[PDB]
Structure formats: C-alpha cells, structure tokens
Design a protein around this ligand. Structure first.
Ligand SMILES: Nc1ncnc2c1ncn2[C@@H]1O[C@H](COP(=O)(O)OP(=O)(O)NP(=O)(O)O)[C@@H](O)[C@H]1O
Ligand SMILES: Nc1ncnc2c1ncn2[C@@H]1O[C@H](COP(=O)(O)OP(=O)(O)NP(=O)(O)O)[C@@H](O)[C@H]1O
Ligand SMILES: O=C(CO)CO
Ligand SMILES: O=C(CO)CO
Ligand SMILES: [Mg+2]
Ligand SMILES: [Mg+2]
Ligand SMILES: [Mg+2]
Ligand SMILES: [Mg+2]
Lengths: 537, 537
C-alpha cells in the first residue's frame, strides 16, 4: 500500500519527462538519445556559441528542472531516479551533448550525492577539453548549525540569472561570477504539515506532526530543524519571516518567491500569500514570484519562501522574460481595492389594503398550514429531519401575523405575492423557504406583467421546478401542486376538482417509501390546503 | 486535529480573495464593497454595455472562480464559505453591482444549493428590471444513474465560450445559446486516491481506499460512483478514457483538459499526461489544456479529464486569449523528439609501459591497502556500514591486477592517474569510489598540464574537498592526506616526515568519537600507506 499514480516503477522518471514534453508551451523540449538509464532533456534551439547552463538533480521536484529548460535559462537538465542524483555517466553525456567552446556552467543543489556525481563528471569533462564550471547552491537557512546548507526553491532564481548572461553571449567566467552573486543573495525557508507519498509500498504514512508543523523539512523528505506548536497560517508565516529577516541585509529591495511544495491547496497557498503580504517583510517587496509549484517535493503539504536581494544586475535579469515551460512572471504585490456600486435596495415596497375576499384566503390558507405543524413533522420524521410542519408553520404564522396587524397589501396580488416571497425565506430556513420564495416571487412577476391568478401560480411552479430540479414523480410537493394547478387551468373555478387532483398526487408519493405514514410532508401540506379552499366554495 | 494552513476560521474565505488579488497578473481584480458576509470579486474594467457573465459557488475550488474573472471570461464571481453556495443576498448584490442593460448570464454548477440560491436571486433580479439568465452546468459522467449530473472542471470551458461572445458585444440571448451549446458538448470524469483535508477538526482522516482509487469523487468530497482495484496510472487513465469515449460522438475533434484536484504531485500529473497521450483518445486531440489546477477540491489527491467537442464556434473561442488570472493557454499535444549529439567516448586511452620505480609504488601502495581490508572494516563498523576495508581493497586488488597483467601505463603518470581515476568508481561503489576518482582524475589533469607529482596530488585533494565538502577536522581521510601532502610540498623527498604528518592527523580523528577503536577508516588507510612508503626510503 501507498498513494501514487504511476505505471511501471522502472519507467517512472522517463514517463515524467514524456508528459513534461507533451505539454511544452514552446515545444522547445527534446530528449537526448542515449542508453535508457540516462535521462536527459535538452533545448531544441541549441546555441553552442553561448555558454551552456546545465542543471539537474533527482526526480519528484517537478517542474524542476526540465521545467526551466530553454531560451533565457537552462540549456539541459539531467534527471535521476526519484529523490536521487543522476549517474556520473549522465551528467557527462549531458555536458558533451550540449557544451560548446564557450563552456558550460553546472548549477548543482547542495547535497553530497549531486555534488559527488556532477563533480567527477565536470572533471572527466575538463579532461576532454570541455571548459567546465560548477556552482553549488545552498539557500536553506533552516539549520544554521549545519556545515552544508541544503539547496532548495531558490536554486531556480540562480538559473534565471545564469541564463540571462548565458544568452546575451557572455564568457563562462562572467556567467559563474554573476551566478554565484545571486546565489549568495538568496535565502530560502520551508515548512510542512506532512511529508510526501513515495512510488513504493512503505511501513507507515509520511512523517506528520498532529496539529503541528515541521520547519525546514528537506525536499527529499529529510528531517527539518524545529517543530512549530501550531498550524496557524499567520503565526507560521510570521515566524518564517523573522528567521528570513534575520539573515537578510537590514536594507535592500527584494523579490520573494512563494513555492508550493506540491500538496498545499490553492486556497491555502493564497492565504499564505495574504499572510506574507501583511508580514513585517512587505515594505521591502517590489516583486512576488508565486504562489506556484516551482521546486516541489512530490505531494508534500508544505510551502517555501525565498528572498533575493535586488542589488545591481539581479533584478534586471529576474524580470527579463524567457522561453521556459513553468517559469512564473514576477508580479508586484497588488493592493486590494474596493469598487463600489449603486446598489438599489430590494426590499419590496407596499401600501396596506383591505380585501374581504383575498384576506379570507390568506387567513384560511395560513391557518390551515399552522395547525398541521405536528402531523407534518411526524411525516417528515419518517422521511427526513422531522422539521416540515414547524418550518411550514413559521412561514404561515408570519404571513398570518402580517394579516392580523393589517399590514398586508391584500388589494394588489402581484405585490402580495412579491411580499410573501420576500419574507418566507426569513421565517423559514432551509430549501423549502427558498423554494416557497421562488414560487411566489416568480408568481408575482407574472401577475405584475398582467396575468390571472392561476397562470402566475402555474409559472411560480415552473420556476420552482427549474431551480429546485424536481419533476412530477419525485415524491415531492410538486406531485400535488402541478395536478392541482393543472386542474385550475382547465376549470378555473372548480376547487373540488383541484383538491381531488392534489389528494391523488399526494397519494402517489405514498406508493414509493424506503423509510399513509410514508407520505411526503410537502404533498400533504399542499393537498390539505386545496381541501381547505374547496370546503368553502 | 487537522491539516490546514489558515488563521481565523471566519476570515477564511475573505483571506483567500485577498491573496488571489495580491497576485493578479493583470491587476484587474477588485472586491465589491459590501457587508462582510458577502464576498464578491468583480473586474475593474467593468463594461456594462456587454452582457455580464456572473458565476460563483463555494470556496475550496481554487482558482475557480475568482481566477477566471476579467476580459474574455467572468465579469464577477460570488464566493460562499468552504464547499457551500453563497447567500441569495450575495448573488443578487452581484447582479445589480455589475449588470448593465444588455443583461447578465449566471453560469451555475449543478448542485441543489447553488441552483436554489442563485435561482431565487435571478428571480428577485428579474423583478428589478435586470434581464437575467441562468445556465446550469452538469458535465460529470461518473453517475449516469443520477438525475442531476454534478458540475465540475468543465464548467470553466463553458465560461471561456460565454465570455467570448460577451466581450464581442453580443446579445444576452446569444450568449446563453452559445453557452449551453458548449456545455452540452462537455464531458468530465474525475478520480481520487484520497479526499481533501478541511479547515476544521474532524473525527478521522479523509476518505481513502488503500491501494485503490475512487472514481467520480465529487468536488465537495462527495462519494463517487465506483472504486478501481488499483492505483496504476495507465490502467486508471485508460478506464476513464473508455467511459469518456462512451459518451462522446463517434467522430469529432476535441480539446482535453487535464485538471489537478489539488493534491497530485506535478510529477504524477505529468505521467497521467503521458498516459492520456498514449490513450485510445489521442488520435482526436488537437489541443491540451493542462496539466494544471483549474477547478480543485482543496488538496484532494485526484485529477480530472474534461473533453469538449470542437464542432463550430467552440474551438474559435477556446483559443482566443483572455485577461484572467489562472486561465491556461491550450497547447497541441507535442511529439517527443530525440536530439542526437556527437558524443565522444571518455574511455581513457593508454599504451602499456614498464617502470621499475613507479611499479614498485603501485605494487607497495596497492598491496598495503589490500591487507588492511579486515581492520578497516572493523573500524568502519564502529563508525559506519563496516564496508571500508572491503571497498578500498576492491580498488586496490583491481589496480594490483592491472599491474600484474602488465596492462598499466607506468611510464606516463598523468595517464596512469587518469586511468586509475576512470576505474576505481567501477570496482568500488559508494562515495569513496567517486571521491577516490575525483582525486586521481583531477590529479592527472594537473600532471598532464606539466606539474610535479606532489603538486598534482595536492590539487587532486583540493578538488576532493571542493566536491566532497570535507575540511580538515571533519574526522575524514582529508585529516591525514592534507598534512601528509603539505609535508611533501615542503620536503618533497622526506617520506618519514609525510608519514608522521598523516599518523598525527589520523590520530586527531580518534579524539572525537560518538560510537584507537574510534579511528576513521579513511585516515588510517591513508596513514598506513605513507608508512609503507617511508619504510623503504
Ligand atoms: N425541488 C425540490 N427539492 C427538494 N425538496 C422539495 C422540492 N420541492 C418541494 N420540496 C419539499 O421540501 C420539503 C422538505 O421539508 P423542509 O421543511 O424544507 O425540511 P428539509 O427540506 O427536509 N431540511 P433543509 O435542507 O434544511 O431545508 C419536502 O416535504 C418536499 O416536499
Ligand atoms: N567528503 C569526503 N571527503 C573526503 N573523504 C570522505 C568524505 N566523506 C567520507 N570520506 C572518507 O571515506 C570513508 C568512507 O568509507 P566507506 O567504506 O566508503 O563507507 P561509506 O562512506 O558509508 N560509503 P557509502 O555507503 O556509499 O556512503 C570514510 O572513512 C571517510 O574517511
Ligand atoms: O532530489 C534530491 C536528490 O539529491 C536533490 O536533487
Ligand atoms: O463547493 C460546491 C458548493 O455547492 C460547488 O460550488
Ligand atoms: Mg425536512
Ligand atoms: Mg431542515
Ligand atoms: Mg563505510
Ligand atoms: Mg558503502
């Protein structure tokens, strides 16, 4: 057991190169022909004139590094198995394959493996006349007590710079110089809630600290430095900023790169951006690079923060656009702005009126429902959350009240409907309330545009179905309403006819239980209403 | 206990809007002033003239939908809490705030919540004169037995189209029409290894099926349809393709969108792309949209596949560039190509020679090490993996052999070194081998460029330090080599002097254990070598 989408373990690395290629925005990536145990990617527009910038490292960091290959950055990338440096054979095959006479600059992440392998390589290469140069990058500041700073997220910035001068046609020695400069002005710090899943069956889940967060967890999954007693975005980001400010000049503009280690939600990544924005670090940030997954660790739920000082040339090269696959384009921290609108109140206006007829109905209808409360709750109990009767009564009691306080526009229906619509949702929560609002609301806009009572009701229904998604036969109040309304559309004055129609429909809902004790509360509610009307006309 | 980067639970949604804004590439996003319980984002370049396309839904799907706001797509986006539709109050405030006279088209994801809320809204809006229109999107094909297809990943394509016609200045009724057209030509299917983590303490971990994968897992984390008996990339992707082909025309070009639900590694996402590339679906794909996180479910470890038929207008509108935050730019499935190089073999050339002197050393040195094997293994056992003696002997026995078979270029050192360098890594695996290769290899390139034996050795060392990262005092063989080499650089012929130097250094490594039983194998190995040399001169 594990949790990894992959086919043939042994074709893992390869398959990733393929898919990386099959998605090249600039179709500028190409695999270098060679033994299967050597996985190299090289830019199709090879310019052996300029100094070639080669980079690499293990897999699982993705897009690093095939991602940053092409005009403006990496010439080629050497990929080894998951979390393991390539062979010497491969780093060499790469130098030869793409290095011209201007030379090549190997940019290696600070780890004894990559160093040793890329190193022996660079040597066997020097010996073949190739002018080689190697720059070890160590930007992690998470373990100051350790001799060799781990190389992480910041590495790619070192590329951006090196690549700049490379394309401009500068001498190898000038590339290296400018490359190291950036490096020594780069500081990265990472945090993670839980490690990453691997492409193999393992003992137990990934390292994890319940409720806590590990600071400085290595991209290979290495153990970090400390453990923060919380998972709180603000707190955690601030702490990181301190440790970051603690190792950055007391003054100097800078660009900050927010890296997603692979398993943080886009949402979370966003909060973290808001956190760093309100960070004591804000007042010196002229640029943001992220949120984005730039140098990940498989699906590790962690993010990183990389700061780079803008002294001299650095900034110029950052901002220069390039032709890579995943390189993000620096963006100055925008300022949240509040746009305003001429927002007209919806609160329906009305002027109280009396109307012996309509009032008699509003009274009868409202009252009818109000008594059922208990029984409808009973029915809703064998079916759902036993809240129907109470829910429906709230809406009734409310309009019933407004009736008695003489505050109802009885003389104008299109307005009375619109009013009821705009009030039920309040007294009654839940879908019902909204559905019962959609009904009248849509109804009143049919009456308004000059239509009879039955045509509005029927349309108020059509809308209730459109949004509510319910048809006849779904064991719903629609099962009694429609029939009832379809009967009034024929014989507009025959209330017995419409009553019977509802009662029949209300009964169908009784013939498909999975819990007359299986009856759908809505249907009943409806039917008993039309029954009330009929026993008075 | 949980696993979520967030500060104030109640400011969750808001905070995400902020960070989404603070990163706007086009600085075209702005929050609409309103009560705090109403979270709306609207494009700054509001053009009431064109029909406004409003969309929304819960949070946690991220960049959807604030990410797709701007020229060419969404006018505004209404955001509700995590995995919960916005209020009616909010969907309305949005329509008013940005809808002109040309009207507005609400594009809603198929879920009873969003429908009901955005619906009552659209109604209360119609009533205020606003020409409103609502399009429910349902592209999930994972549960054909269900009445209402869930809305997912494909939704954004529906936007791309609707937005197209909107900006061109078309009539509301033309937008809707073209919008629905795309929708009905969109088919999505998702898979997940495990659900997502939420911003709250919960009973147990997210749904998960050890070794298996859930098909049709809802973006809210709903239960999917089936469960595949494997996690295999190829298998899983193929199955999805079948079910996809099963619901797509037997003929027709199409674009496919590969969506990352939030928690899949970039690497995995890439394999899945390679899988779909070799899929029975390839021969009809003129475009790829992804891999990318477009409509996620927090950190859910799953991906989705959305197919859209290119009949008529659809394709024209897809490809049109827009001014959004996260909209990807369709890219035709590239073809992996193999670039070739003029790769010169490194295999060092040499012509056998005899040399009484040098051979006497190669013999003495090689032999000296060869005997230690046992003792060096003992020392390496109290310190590391008890493999030193054996490792070092392999390298010795090997050169010792080559000595005896008269196959060594004894007459030319620069070549003998270069040869030994190019052979030790083979007989001896592990860092030692590589270090011992870096030594001689770099050495031979110093002798080659005309230098004495001691200057090469000293340089071979300098390199070993540069790549190996070890300095004097790190309890390493460097602790005996350097002193020894530093002694020969002064008195080049005094072997006793150099011996003593090593023996002293070898002894320092003895004064900092954490396991003369604490001695570093490397150091000893070295010292006993210079001792051998001295007891013969
Ligand atoms: N399209 C529809 N979808 C769902 N329910 C409907 C629909 N049309 C009518 N109903 C009725 O809605 C009633 C539900 O009762 P109600 O008093 O709202 O409690 P509830 O809906 O079960 N809980 P809640 O989701 O919080 O509103 C049922 O009796 C159904 O008859
Ligand atoms: N960076 C370094 N530079 C120089 N010498 C080193 C360095 N690291 C280790 N050594 C020496 O190399 C010896 C390593 O012994 P060895 O028998 O190769 O076991 P090992 O280090 O565990 N090989 P491996 O299993 O690949 O890690 C030690 O005695 C050290 O003296
Ligand atoms: O993945 C790690 C292996 O060394 C860094 O490349
Ligand atoms: O998050 C979901 C809420 O219904 C989809 O918008
Ligand atoms: Mg109920
Ligand atoms: Mg309820
Ligand atoms: Mg050992
Ligand atoms: Mg070993």
């Amino acid at each position: 057991a594990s949790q990894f989408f992959f086919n043939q373990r042994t074709h893992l690395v390869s398959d990733v190169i393929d898919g990386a290629i099959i998605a090249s925005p600039w179709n500028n990536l190409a695999r270098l022909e060679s033994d299967p145990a050597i996985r190299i990617v090289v830019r199709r527009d090879l310019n052996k004139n300029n100094v070639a910038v080669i980079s690499g490292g293990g897999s699982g960091h993705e897009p690093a590094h095939v991602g940053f290959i092409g005009k403006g950055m990496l010439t080629a990338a050497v990929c080894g198995d998951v979390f393991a440096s390539p062979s010497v054979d491969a780093v060499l095959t790469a130098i030869q394959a793409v290095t011209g006479e201007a030379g090549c600059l190997l940019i290696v992440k600070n780890y004894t493996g990559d160093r040793l392998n890329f190193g022996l390589a660079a040597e066997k290469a020097r010996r073949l006349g190739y002018n080689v140069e190697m720059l070890i990058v160590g930007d992690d500041i998470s373990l100051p007590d350790n001799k060799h700073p781990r190389g992480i997220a910041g590495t790619i910035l070192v590329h951006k710079i090196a690549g700049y001068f490379a394309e401009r046609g500068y001498n190898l020695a000038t590339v290296l110089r400018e490359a190291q400069y950036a490096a020594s002005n780069t500081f990265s710090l990472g945090v993670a809630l839980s490690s990453c899943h691997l492409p193999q069956e393992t003992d137990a889940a990934p390292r994890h600290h319940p409720g806590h967060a590990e600071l400085g967890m290595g991209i290979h999954g290495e153990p970090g430095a400390s453990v923060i007693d919380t998972q709180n975005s603000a707190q955690v980001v601030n702490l990181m900023v301190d440790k970051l400010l603690a190792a950055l000049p007391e003054t100097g503009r800078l660009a900050v790169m927010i890296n997603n280690l692979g398993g943080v939600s886009v949402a979370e990544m966003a909060i973290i951006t808001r956190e760093l924005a309100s960070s004591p670090l804000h007042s010196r940030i002229d640029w943001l690079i992220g949120p984005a997954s730039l140098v990940t660790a498989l699906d590790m739920k962690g993010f990183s923060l990389t700061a780079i000082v803008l002294e001299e040339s650095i900034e110029k090269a950052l901002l220069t656009e390039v032709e890579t696959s995943n390189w993000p384009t620096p963006v100055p921290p925008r300022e949240i702005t509040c746009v305003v609108s001429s927002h007209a109140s919806a609160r329906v206006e009305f002027q109280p009126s009396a109307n012996a007829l309509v009032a008699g109905i509003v009274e009868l209808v409202t009252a009818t429902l109000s008594d059922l409360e208990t029984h409808l709750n009973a029915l809703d109990a064998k079916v759902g959350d036993g809240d129907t009767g109470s829910t429906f009564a709230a809406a009734a009691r409310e309009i019933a009240s407004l009736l008695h306080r003489q505050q109802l526009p009885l003389n104008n229906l299109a307005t009375l409907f619109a009013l009821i619509g705009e009030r039920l949702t309040v007294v009654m929560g839940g879908s019902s309330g909204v559905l019962m609002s959609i009904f009248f609301t849509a109804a009143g806009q049919k009456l308004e545009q000059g239509a009879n009572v039955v045509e509005a009701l029927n349309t108020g229904l059509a809308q209730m179905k459109f949004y509510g998604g319910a048809d006849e036969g779904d064991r719903t109040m629609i099962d009694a309403l429609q029939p009832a309304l379809t009967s009034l559309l024929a014989q507009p004055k025959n209330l017995q006819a419409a009553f019977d129609a509802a009662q029949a429909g209300a009964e169908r809902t009784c013939l498909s239980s999975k819990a007359l004790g299986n009856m759908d509360p809505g249907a009943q509610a409806l039917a008993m209403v039309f029954k009330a009307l009929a026993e008075s006309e």
